[PDB]
Amino acid sequence: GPVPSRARVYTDVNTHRPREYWDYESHVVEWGNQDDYQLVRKLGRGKYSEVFEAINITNNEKVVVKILKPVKKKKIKREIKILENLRGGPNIITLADIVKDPVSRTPALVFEHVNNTDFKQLYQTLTDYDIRFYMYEILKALDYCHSMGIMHRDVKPHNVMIDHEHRKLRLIDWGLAEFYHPGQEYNVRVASRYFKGPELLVDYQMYDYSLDMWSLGCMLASMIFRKEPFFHGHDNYDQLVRIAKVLGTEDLYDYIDKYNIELDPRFNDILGRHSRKRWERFVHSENQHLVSPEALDFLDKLLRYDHQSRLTAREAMEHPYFYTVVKD
Ligand SMILES: COc1cc2c(cc1O)cc1c3c(cc(O)c(OC)c32)CCN1C
């Protein structure tokens, strides 16, 4: 069978936390007053939720309300517990309240308001400096939640809210997030297609925080090369083929051989043989102002097949790519 794997950092954070910290099934929800919040505008739908802009009439402040679709009590408590555990951390969206919505009869999560502008137009304007700045801010959020024993598992542009006016960033939608426990096998059906790590795509279940670093790498590639999304697969099989056309098939085989993983034989007719490519081939006159040797080296160290070989969030913050970013 497949070889087991462990996170190289924060391996035992939940082992030494009190049980109450990660045992979210036993969490008791403390309910606020639903009448404090009046819905103003619907912002959108998740697969598991409807999201609204609202006003907190106890202070006339804007908030965001996420009314959960009826999903398993356990998944609901998981997101709630994780949000409470991470509350106050760097660039973590703040859960301000939880109320019972009278119409859905489900929990409605109340968050701090974030004044974003849609990433597709935002990514279209970001400068080299902006990219490095906001990448560093995401890394603060990721190192924090990883250090707190939680993997996000759905890192993507849509879940990184940016108030560009106040240079403010928040990592949102912790509905797929999980507690990391050494040796635990996890559902590989997480993250959005373009951001799925190789471990998911080859059906390796014993993954860890490093999944988020692959996803972050996919974001970075899309930003510095101005190509959305970078790995544009038409399904989960083609997604791996797209990755292999850049990282090469020999290192893919080295990866799965290391963990004694067998590739799904569906790949026999579609994977082919591909050399590893140098990142310079994706540079052109319309993105070169966003590219530097530091950017390419940083990207190269995020986008590794082997989840154990990727930069940790902390290591990433040490990278020369961020030397030019003003620290606080
Ligand atoms: C914090 O301010 C906002 C949050 C969200 C949003 C728009 C916002 O302005 C739009 C999303 C959304 C989702 C899940 C989630 O956990 C969110 O944070 C509460 C949001 C899923 C989809 N819909 C559309």
Side-chain angles (χ1 to χ4, degrees):
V3 170
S5 174
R6 299 286 187 278
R8 293 184 311 154
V9 295
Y10 305 129
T11 316
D12 303 304
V13 281
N14 288 317
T15 314
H16 300 279
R17 289 264 171 190
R19 170 165 182 129
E20 88 203 64
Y21 182 84
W22 50 260
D23 185 23
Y24 59 84
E25 293 180 61
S26 297
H27 176 67
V28 182
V29 171
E30 151 142 14
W31 306 90
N33 286 172
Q34 187 269 341
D35 44 283
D36 290 344
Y37 307 99
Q38 293 233 351
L39 301 181
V40 177
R41 343 187 315 213
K42 187 161 171 189
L43 298 179
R45 269 211 180 109
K47 166 182 229 184
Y48 302 102
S49 68
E50 283 192 326
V51 177
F52 296 82
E53 173 178 299
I55 303 307
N56 183 339
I57 69 176
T58 69
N59 53 31
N60 284 1
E61 302 221 35
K62 294 193 180 180
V63 294
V64 168
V65 179
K66 179 177 178 177
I67 305 181
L68 305 180
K69 285 177 166 75
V71 76
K72 291 193 294 186
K73 220 145 153 29
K74 180 185 154 276
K75 165 149 183 161
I76 291 174
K77 286 201 192 83
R78 187 179 66 188
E79 180 175 354
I80 287 179
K81 185 67 186 180
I82 283 179
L83 286 169
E84 294 187 358
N85 288 346
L86 299 179
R87 186 159 51 210
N91 297 330
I92 309 292
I93 195 72
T94 296
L95 180 66
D97 212 344
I98 311 166
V99 299
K100 192 159 270 201
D101 183 81
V103 176
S104 73
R105 309 213 310 166
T106 63
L109 305 187
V110 182
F111 298 90
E112 61 175 316
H113 178 266
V114 180
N115 214 291
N116 71 340
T117 191
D118 178 63
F119 75 90
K120 336 240 293 185
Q121 184 63 60
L122 187 59
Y123 282 27
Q124 211 81 61
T125 74
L126 293 190
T127 63
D128 180 36
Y129 188 81
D130 283 338
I131 295 175
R132 312 192 191 209
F133 180 91
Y134 283 127
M135 271 289 122
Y136 196 76
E137 294 303 308
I138 297 170
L139 283 169
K140 291 179 190 180
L142 288 180
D143 184 50
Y144 187 71
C145 70
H146 294 171
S147 75
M148 296 285 285
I150 293 152
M151 45 187 169
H152 185 280
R153 305 201 301 176
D154 200 19
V155 172
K156 59 180 185 172
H158 324 245
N159 286 339
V160 177
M161 295 275 291
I162 294 167
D163 188 335
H164 194 46
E165 293 195 35
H166 299 287
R167 314 278 285 182
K168 198 164 66 167
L169 183 149
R170 295 293 187 269
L171 182 55
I172 66 159
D173 200 347
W174 297 79
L176 280 193
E178 258 285 16
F179 292 89
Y180 175 71
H181 300 277
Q184 192 158 130
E185 295 188 323
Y186 295 97
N187 183 10
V188 296
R189 297 195 63 183
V190 299
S192 162
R193 183 195 303 149
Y194 310 136
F195 303 88
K196 291 174 180 289
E199 56 270 53
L200 309 184
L201 300 173
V202 300
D203 208 24
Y204 187 73
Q205 297 184 256
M206 204 174 292
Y207 59 84
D208 59 72
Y209 317 109
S210 53
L211 172 59
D212 293 337
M213 301 309 293
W214 176 271
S215 300
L216 186 70
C218 294
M219 292 189 47
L220 180 68
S222 71
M223 291 174 327
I224 67 177
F225 294 136
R226 288 255 175 99
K227 182 192 186 303
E228 151 187 3
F230 188 66
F231 299 117
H232 202 161
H234 63 243
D235 60 30
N236 288 342
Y237 305 110
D238 186 54
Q239 186 68 22
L240 185 57
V241 179
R242 300 297 188 117
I243 293 171
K245 285 185 178 174
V246 180
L247 275 67
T249 48
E250 288 197 308
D251 288 324
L252 173 59
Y253 273 100
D254 280 0
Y255 175 49
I256 63 175
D257 288 351
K258 168 175 174 184
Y259 296 95
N260 285 4
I261 298 165
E262 185 158 35
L263 256 197
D264 179 351
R266 209 269 163 268
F267 284 108
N268 291 155
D269 291 349
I270 60 170
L271 183 58
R273 292 197 295 175
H274 306 279
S275 59
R276 191 150 199 148
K277 310 305 188 297
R278 303 189 198 265
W279 293 106
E280 282 76 9
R281 72 148 52 187
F282 303 106
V283 182
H284 50 64
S285 55
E286 287 67 53
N287 64 23
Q288 68 185 218
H289 65 290
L290 300 182
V291 181
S292 61
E294 292 75 20
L296 294 187
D297 181 65
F298 175 47
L299 178 65
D300 190 55
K301 289 173 164 57
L302 292 173
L303 293 185
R304 297 270 146 196
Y305 284 119
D306 192 347
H307 52 280
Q308 287 179 12
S309 295
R310 301 171 198 152
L311 290 179
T312 64
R314 193 56 105 98
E315 288 183 307
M317 299 172 66
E318 300 287 289
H319 194 279
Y321 182 59
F322 300 108
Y323 285 176
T324 193
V325 172
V326 168
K327 304 309 182 313
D328 312 280

